Amino acid sequence: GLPTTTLPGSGQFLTTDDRQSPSALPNYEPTPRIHIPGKVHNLLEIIQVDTLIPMNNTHTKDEVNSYLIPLNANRQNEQVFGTNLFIGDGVFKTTLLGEIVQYYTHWSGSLRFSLMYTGPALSSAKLILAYTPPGARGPQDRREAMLGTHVVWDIGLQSTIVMTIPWTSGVQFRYTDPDTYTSAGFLSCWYQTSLILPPETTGQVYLLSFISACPDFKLRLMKDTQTISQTVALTE
Amino acid sequence: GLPTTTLPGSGQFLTTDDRQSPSALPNYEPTPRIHIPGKVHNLLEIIQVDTLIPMNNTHTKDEVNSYLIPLNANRQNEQVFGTNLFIGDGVFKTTLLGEIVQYYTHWSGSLRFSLMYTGPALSSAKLILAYTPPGARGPQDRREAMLGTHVVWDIGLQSTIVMTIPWTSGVQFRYTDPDTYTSAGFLSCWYQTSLILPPETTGQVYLLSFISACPDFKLRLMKDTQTISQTVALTE
Amino acid sequence: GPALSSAKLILAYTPPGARGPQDRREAMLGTHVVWDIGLQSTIVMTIPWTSGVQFRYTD
Amino acid sequence: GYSDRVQQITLGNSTITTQEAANAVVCYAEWPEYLPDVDASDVNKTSKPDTSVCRFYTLDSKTWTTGSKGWCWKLPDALKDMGVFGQNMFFHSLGRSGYTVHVQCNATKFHSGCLLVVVIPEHQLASHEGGNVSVKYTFTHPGERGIDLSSANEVGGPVKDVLYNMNGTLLGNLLIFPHQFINLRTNNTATIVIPYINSVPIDSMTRHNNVSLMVIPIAPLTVPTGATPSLPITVTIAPMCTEFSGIRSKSIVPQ
Amino acid sequence: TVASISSGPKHTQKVPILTANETGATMPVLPSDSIETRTTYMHFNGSETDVECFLGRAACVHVTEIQNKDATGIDNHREAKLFNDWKINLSSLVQLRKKLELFTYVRFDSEYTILATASQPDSANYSSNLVVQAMYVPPGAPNPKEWDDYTWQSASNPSVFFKVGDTSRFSVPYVGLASAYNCFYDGYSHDDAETQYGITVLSHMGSMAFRIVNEHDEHKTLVKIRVYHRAKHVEAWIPRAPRALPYTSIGRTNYPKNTEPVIKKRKGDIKSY
Amino acid sequence: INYYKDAASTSSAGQSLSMDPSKFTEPVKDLMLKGAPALN
Amino acid sequence: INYYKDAASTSSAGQSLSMDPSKFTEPVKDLMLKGAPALN
Ligand SMILES: Cc1cc(CCCCCOc2ccc(C3=NCCO3)cc2)on1
Q1: Where in the cell is it found (chain C)?
Q2: What whole-number distance in Å separates Cα of residue D89 and Cα of residue D97?
Q3: Which of E200, E208, E226, E227 has the most ligand 1 atoms within 8 A of CB, as the residue to mutate?
């Protein structure tokens, strides 16, 4: 008989501990694995695939239309859309990125925001996208917007433009749930010159917008998502 | 005194765990082993010996007669017997194979079904045995039956015919207790030409049928058999 | 057609033994090419020699 | 002078040419291949009809109009009646296949509109009834007709609400599945190569569909002035590396 | 590892930021393709986002309850919660469920922890330590009928006996029939016209059954069982869109009617911040 | 040290440290180079 | 590691991995070859 002493914590059950256990089914042989395409190893692998952002959130019931950012022909100087960058809330929240970020407490890294244009091929347009780093207000006019991170996008044969929100930060991690100290800025978009439709054409054209994370990205300290809850256990 | 921590599960008794225990009889010397023919090591060794199937289940009290499949002289085109292949139920259930399969939850592998003919030596017959893989109904006539796994059996000097139900399956294991998704097919038998008795002879002739497992076979995840129960403890 | 128009046609060869196809579904089950009208103005379909007998009559 | 743009796919006795492609997607970066022995379970030798089943079948055409919500086809169902592919299907106990899907929609440089073409492995649909109402067989086996998301709820059928992918997930995130867009201004076809994806090496072709192909208008169709307000969309699909096993009597399926 | 390299002004014919999303790719664009950057290192590995880590902590998967009371004159033990069972499944409680359904097929060993606590609602005396018996009853095994049937002998079926207030823990290998468990299944068990549709047909992993071994004392004792499940040795294939609407049933994808808009409406314009 | 005989009884697995998003982010048939035109 | 002195006190035995059904499936005196006639 070897002398032992038990410490504080004996008998506790910590849902996060990782130890060995007896197998209830001694000697059982599991089914062989066969090959299946698509294996995922890290959630970091999947948040780099871009998905659509319901940017046009202004509706009243969920609709395919809140994915469409409208553009008006012949407007000059004006603003196309605006949003803050609380990736865990608001427009971002239902996107795959938003949806995964919510399983973690802290995030750090660059984001990739792209816009794909869908107007007739014989039209043309020049837009400016601007990222405003924390510390200033959402820009109120392009002059204000153009003094921060921006890209003049020229609509052409190449249909999409990929803007990166480079990680601009004092503190090396931000909270995924919106927090002030930790806030990330604003994203706005304005006409640089203006949309022009060809003859025989009319109305609004739309941009689709996507979001995905750069390879830069870090997420840490897992927790429970506000995105799902329940009141009684389900049954069959 | 070495510091320890006890984990969740301490003090539990799991009937399936395998550990050391003090011997109550320290130093006792067991009787020497002598040699005995017949040692069994695996249940897989014994389910390869074939045993008779009470195929003729149509009686009302258990009788030697439900082991006998009758054959009629001069019938043409017609059907000799039919059964599904739920090896854990129905005809199969009391056979040694059926009886062991019931100690496990899953089975996979090929089955060997053979028929031994017992009619007078001066008679003759040609039968077709057909295996119908999952997905179609039990065949309704030989034409239907002959399009799946089948063997034309010619009754001769060699008294038995061994049909194999080759493992035909998407999923690599099936349930021993009958389940749909997991179902294995049907087995039917029809006259290929017809039984013919010699002169001075009359009546029905019978086939005996056996079942055993091919060396192919796998059984896993042990459990309790529905084949035995009790209401009070027995006594001497 | 005008350069600013567009079209997609299917050409189908039906080997001997069946009737002239009566609808595209029927037609598309034999030798066929989906032609996409583009910059490249012509499409070349080949009727590959499908035959039991190695020569046919011209009449 | 090769462009990403022009392409030719020849499979069997059938060929497709596109002069306005946008590359092609190969699901999960894997190309269809036959079933290796190391992965095999059923002991039966399989049948590989090759060129008689691995050719292009063009399903009947759809009509995109300003009110369209989107269409959904299931595989191998959509092909259950195409030539010898279909016969093989009803006649063997098990079968396995990959596909090349080519979705076609051409317009002019004055039209606008953008379709999402996506392949969803194991797309289990939801009942519009809620609770635990099931979706009857016939409803998930529309055949070449596919399911029309702008048709009405029916009884025993699935829900046809587009912002929810017919299953409780948002349209916006379908982009995690192999997919390609058809943006009239760019593109005129979409091509996706689908490798066989299952948790078993071979399965039944009638009780289980392993992918739904979905074409969904996202930026509404907008035709030039006084143009007819609609465009046809055509779907052509070719089984590739098909194998059938466990031949017999010929399945009888509901309805 | 560098998180960003140093990059300066650019005036090229080579534009990495113009792409064609119609192709289905997400081109790997970085901050340094469009602004001037400085070197910085990652200092991080992505350890805690590994799927083994993501699915590897215990989650509550089931809460049931049984009572110890005099069974004298009870015609239906099962019905008196003299013992109860559970039709094993991992989709009944929905926190762990959303996590698993981020994948289509999943393969793992399970580690179960079972906590059992007692409650004495009706003012009482001395509680004699109750011992719970959890026994696994796989498909095609004599289901138990009374709280003290021959079934409980469990001569071939793994069972664990632990005390109420304590915890039991053991681990079961991956028992799936196929190579992975289907998180989704767009099929039927056969081609009938009315057979159920979903996985429920696929995932009939049998039920688990609990009972108290103790005979009855003078008062009644409520024992409530909580089963926790931890995946170990995880393998996941084919990512899917996360669950947006609420769940209604074990094993079907169905969402409730007249559900509410899941995308938050702006308080303001598209232009709003 | 494993104290138990069966593999299911061992603790959690250890980090894939595999990580290859290209099956998801770039499943295109003809390779796309960043910087080269998307559609040629 | 055995902690105890007696052999009865050790854990379960380890798989025979013996397996030879012929004493049960083919106890015939003159050897039968599959493929050759049963009765000559
Ligand atoms: C998908 C999916 C995955 C799972 C979990 C399957 C777990 C296998 C069977 O689970 C058990 C549970 C309890 C016991 C047990 N044996 C003695 C006491 O409890 C054995 C196996 O369920 N659905």
Answers
A1: Virion; Host cytoplasm
A2: 11
A3: E208
What are the extents of the domains in chain B? 1-236
Q: Are A103 and E54 in contact (CB under 8 A)?
A: yes
Residue of G nearest to B27 (CA): G6
Distance CA D185, CA A155 (A): 11
The residue behind tokens 């020699």 is C49
What domains does chain D contain, in order, with CATH numbers?
1-255 (2.60.120.20)
Q: What's the per-residue H, E or C state across chain D?
A: CCCCCCEEEEECCEEEEECCCCCCEEHHHCCCCCCCHHHCCCCCCCECCHHHCCCCEECCCEEEECCCCCEEEEECHHHCCCHHHHHHHHHEEEEEEEEEEEEECCCCCCCEEEEEEEEEECCCCCECCCCCCCCCHHHHCCHHHCEECCCCCCCCCECCCHHHCCCCECHHHHHHCCEEEEECCCCCEEEEEECCCCCCCCECCCCECCEEEEEEEEEEEECCCCCCCEEEEEEEEEEEEEEEEEECCCCCCCC
For the CA atoms of E22, E28, E34, E38, the dihedral, rounded to the nearest 10 degrees, stands at 170
Nearest residue on chain D to A236, alpha-carbon basis: D132
Q: In units of Å, what resolution does this entry have?
A: 3.0
Q: Cβ–Cβ contacts within 10 Å for residue B4, how many?
A: 11
Q: Check residue B96 and report its DSSP letter.
A: H
Q: What CATH number did the domain enclosing E150 receive?
A: 2.60.120.20
- Secondary structure of chain C in the HEC alphabet? CCCCCCCEEEEEECCECECCCCCHHHHHCCEEEEEECCCCCCCCCCCCCCCCCCCCCCC
Cα E32 to chain centroid, rounded: 41
F contacts of D193 (beta carbons < 8 Å):
29
| Structural domains for chain G | 1-40 (4.10.80.10)
3-state secondary structure of B106: strand
3-class secondary structure per residue, chain A = CCCEEECCCCCCCCCCCCCCCCECCCCCCCCCCCCCCCEECEHHHHCCCCEECCCCCCCCCCCHHHCEEEECECCCCCEEEEEECCCCCHHHHHCHHHHHHCCEEEEECCEEEEEEECCCCCCECEEEEEEECECECCCCCHHHHHCCEEEEEECCCCCEEEEEECCCCCCCCEECCCCCCCCCCEEEEEECCCEECCCCCCCCEEEEEEEEECCCCEEEEECCCCCCCCCCCCCC
Identify which of C25, C29, C35 has the shortest CB distance to residue D17: C35
* Cβ-contact B85, B129 below 8 angstroms: no
D198: Cβ contacts below 8 Å, ≥ 6 apart: A36, D96, D210
Its domain, for residue E57, covers 1-273
- E110 alpha carbon – ligand 1 mean position (Å): 7
Residues of chain E with C-beta less than 8 angstroms from the C-beta of D178:
24
The CATH topology of domain B1-236 is Jelly Rolls (2.60.120)
List of chain D residues whose C-beta atoms are within 8 Å of the C-beta of residue B169: 41-42, 94
Spatial separation of the C-alpha atoms in residues A198 and A73, rounded to whole Å = 10
Q: Which residues of D touch F28 (CB under 8 A)?
A: 23-26
* Cα D196 → chain centroid: 13
**With an 8 Å Cβ cutoff, is G21 touching chain B?**
yes
Is the C-beta atom of E112 inside 6 A of ligand 1? yes
H, E, C per residue of B152-209: EEECCCCCEEEEEECCCCCCCCEECCCCCCCCCCEEEEEECCCEECCCCCCCCEEEEE
The rounded Å distance from CA E116 to ligand 1 centre is 18
CB contact under 8 A, A64 and D183: no
E19: which 2 tokens? 């792409």
The count of structural domains within chain E is 1
